Every structure is written in C-alpha cells, then in structure tokens.
C-alpha cells in the first residue's frame, strides 16, 4: 500500500538520476559548441618593443610581423623575450604565456642532483672542515666580509685523486650546505659556439643567483665532447679563454646572493696561476688517498644498503684489496652482490665480498680512460 507507493517513488527517483545524466550530456554538448568558435593563436616570441603601441615579434615558424597589443595585455610583462599569442588573422598580441621545453637549458638549470649522505665515502677531514668553513662564512654573513672589505672568496678547488673524491663527494657538498647544486660539466655550456660558452655560464650564474643557498660546482670542467681543446691550429684553448672570462664573471659583474662559484674540480690538466691568486681561488682543498682504516669506514657506508650473512669481517676484506677508490669499494659491494646472486643467496657471506675484492684488486691493477691531472 503506502510502502508499495514509496517503492514506485524510488523508481521515479532512479529515472530522475538518469535525467540528470542527460542534462550533463547537454551541458557537455554546449561546452563543445562554445569551444568550436575559438580559432587558436600563432605562438611567437617578442623580438623587441618597437613602440608602446607596436612590438616587433617573430613567429616560431620564422616569418616576422610587427604586431600591436590587444586590451589589458600588461605591456610591462610583454617585455622582449616573452612568448606571446598572435591572432591568426589580425596578427596582434592576444595574451602573454611563457612555456619553453628548454631541454639544453634544463641541463644548464637544476639537472645536477645532491647526495643526501654526509659521508658517502667518509674522508670528511677537511671536506666538512676547510671546505665548509670557507663557503659558510660568506653564506652566513656576506656583510661581515664587507666590513672586512675583502671580496668573499668566489670559489675553492678540490684537487684530489680521481673517483675517490671526484665520482663521490662531488654532490656530498650539496648536503653539507643543504641545497641543490649546479654542475658545470661544460658539455651543455659548449654547444655550437665557442664564444657562447661564457655567455651560457653567465646564464647559469644568473640561475645560481636565484637561489642564495645553491652553490655553483665546476665539476668535470675540462670534460667536454671528445677531449678538451688546448691551444692548437685546428682548435685553440677556448676553454682557457672561458676560464679568464669566468674570472671576470666571478668578481665584480656577477657576484651577489653570497653564491660561491667553487671550481672544485681536479679534472682540468692546467690551473691558471692568476686564478690561484687570493680572490679568484682564495684557498685550495686537497682530497687525499684513503688511509685503509678510512676505506673500512667507506666499505661500511657502502655496506649499509646490503643484506649480509652477518659473519662478515669488513677489515679482512678491506685488507685483502687496497682499492683506494670509493667507487672501487662500492664496486666491491656490488660484485659481492653478484657473487651472492650466484647460488641464489639473498645474504652476502664474507667470502663473497673477499671474492669480489680479489676481482676489484685486478680492476685496481688495470685502469683506462684516465687523462685528468690537477696542476
């Protein structure tokens, strides 16, 4: 009776829900029709402002047309170098939109990662001491340096054995200052113009200025496509000219936000004596070969992400091979994992690490593709 009538009302409510879905379909159709009217806008970049009324712009495809702004186009935000929307028929600025893929620029931007671990390879005797002390005083107080009147030292050079302080501890400094760093490999910086390399470095310096904590790191500065070009008939020392240009950029024209452009690289074969002079290179920090007791500590840090039997004498494994490389010690751990993979053992026995160390000892004996010496 009344309950049956309530059930009929429920069926009507289900029909009402279907009507709401039909209304949603009608709303979608209305939106689609409204969309059809829009005709798109040519994407172009403003070359320059000819006048407040008209700005010269170039379409991405290539034809350039002088164009005029539309309504409230915020001409202050229409400054040249801004991507703009151009009417298909009118060819006049419609809106300011900035979107660039910038793949090469991304390599020159924040591509470099920072290693969170304070001691990935340990060996922090001066790394968290001298290196931290020189960078921290300007970073904490540029004004204190200004009271002394000495220009805050722009950068320091971590000359060291390759791999042990070069492959690792390169991004450990980023954790020490607790900020992401920019890696000046210079492969992205030198692309199609030898002259543009300094200008691209200036763009990176401006990006570095954007973050006061971020510190420029000139890691692998010599590294480039093929090999670094020293003075020669086919190719001259463009990199050496860039280094002199870098000295000019570091002091005076581009120094702000207490950002340190540390040349912490043992990659360059030759170090400029003028650069060594206090100011451009106020202090140089020397990474040192491991003390073996230090290598045991490095092996423990590398062993941290490792599943082991637990009957492991790391000192015995360290004594068995004097690799003297943080990467080689990491290799010992990885090869021990390969030995563990053989025989399907999730745990790694001490013998597996020792077998890996013997293979690593052979790798320590034979090395190739190393042509970089500090000074």
């Amino acid at each position: 009776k009344l309950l049956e009538h309530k059930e009929i009302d429920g069926r009507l409510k289900e029909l009402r829900e279907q009507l709401k879905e039909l209304t949603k379909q009608y709303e979608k159709s209305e939106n689609d029709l409204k969309a059809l009217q829009s005709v798109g806008q040519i994407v172009g970049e403003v070359l320059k402002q000819l006048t407040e009324e008209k700005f010269i712009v170039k379409a991405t495809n290539g034809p350039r047309y002088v164009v005029g702004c539309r309504r409230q186009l915020d001409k202050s935000k229409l400054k040249p170098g801004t991507r703009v929307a151009l009417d298909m028929t009118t060819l006049t600025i419609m809106r300011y939109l900035p979107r660039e893929v910038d793949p090469l620029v991304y390599n020159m931007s924040h591509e470099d990662p920072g290693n969170v671990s304070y001691s990935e390879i340990g060996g922090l005797s001066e790394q968290i001491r001298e290196l931290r002390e020189v960078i921290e005083l300007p970073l904490t107080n540029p004004e204190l340096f200004q009271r002394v009147g000495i220009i805050p030292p722009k950068g320091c050079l971590l000359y060291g054995p390759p791999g042990t302080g070069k492959t690792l501890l390169a991004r450990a400094v980023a954790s020490q200052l607790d900020c992401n760093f920019l890696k000046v490999v210079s492969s992205s910086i030198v692309d199609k113009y030898i002259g543009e390399s300094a200008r691209l470095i200036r763009e990176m310096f401006n990006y570095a200025r954007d973050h006061q904590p971020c510190i420029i790191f000139m890691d692998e500065i010599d590294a480039i496509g093929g090999r670094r070009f020293s003075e020669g008939t086919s190719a001259d020392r463009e990199i050496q000219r860039t280094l002199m240009e870098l000295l000019n950029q570091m002091d005076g024209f581009d120094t702000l936000h207490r950002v340190k452009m540390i040349m912490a690289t043992n990659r360059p074969d030759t170090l400029d004596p003028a650069l060594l002079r206090p100011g451009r290179l106020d202090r140089k920090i020397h990474i040192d070969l491991p003390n073996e007791q230090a290598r045991l500590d490095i092996l423990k840090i590398h062993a941290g992400p490792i599943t082991k039997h637990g009957e492991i004498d790391y000192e015995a494994i360290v004594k068995l091979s004097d690799g003297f490389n943080g990467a080689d010690l990491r290799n010992v751990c990885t090869e021990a994992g390969m030995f563990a993979i053989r025989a399907d053992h999730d745990f790694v026995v001490q013998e597996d690490f020792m077998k890996a160390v013997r293979k690593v000892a052979d790798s320590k004996k034979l090395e190739s593709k190393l042509d970089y010496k500090p000074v």
Binding site: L33, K34, A35, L36, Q37
Partner: protein
C-alpha cells in the same frame, strides 16, 4: 498590464543565434519609446528571469541632438 512576450520566439531565436556565436548570450532587452512606460518594470521582471543581470537599453530610433 496587457503585455505579451513570445517564449518560443525568445527561446528558438536565442538558441539559433547562440549557435552562430558562443560568446553571444542574452544580456538584456532594448525598447524605443523614449519616455519609459510603467509596463517596463513588469517586462523587466520577465527579462530578469531570462538573464541573471539583464539591462534595458532605451535606444531612440529617431535621433535628436
């Protein structure tokens, strides 16, 4: 009080005109008769129903100075 507005003409023409312009929407109504008639407010209430913030434009077909 004897005022008639055709619902069908307003709805059908507006829909066809809206099909020609998505931007186009009912925004108000226009009348001549420079002295505003008392009936205008009643017509306005129907106009208010069609458009949330509609306006009346008293355009004069015979221009003056």
């Amino acid at each position: 009080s004897v005022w008639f507005l055709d619902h069908d003409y307003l709805e059908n023409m507006y829909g066809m005109f809206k099909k020609v312009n998505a931007r186009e929407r009912i925004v108000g109504w226009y009348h001549t008769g420079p002295k505003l008639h008392k009936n205008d407010i009643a017509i306005n209430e129907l106009m208010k129903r069609y458009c949330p913030n509609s306006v009346l434009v008293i355009i004069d077909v015979k221009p003056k100075d």
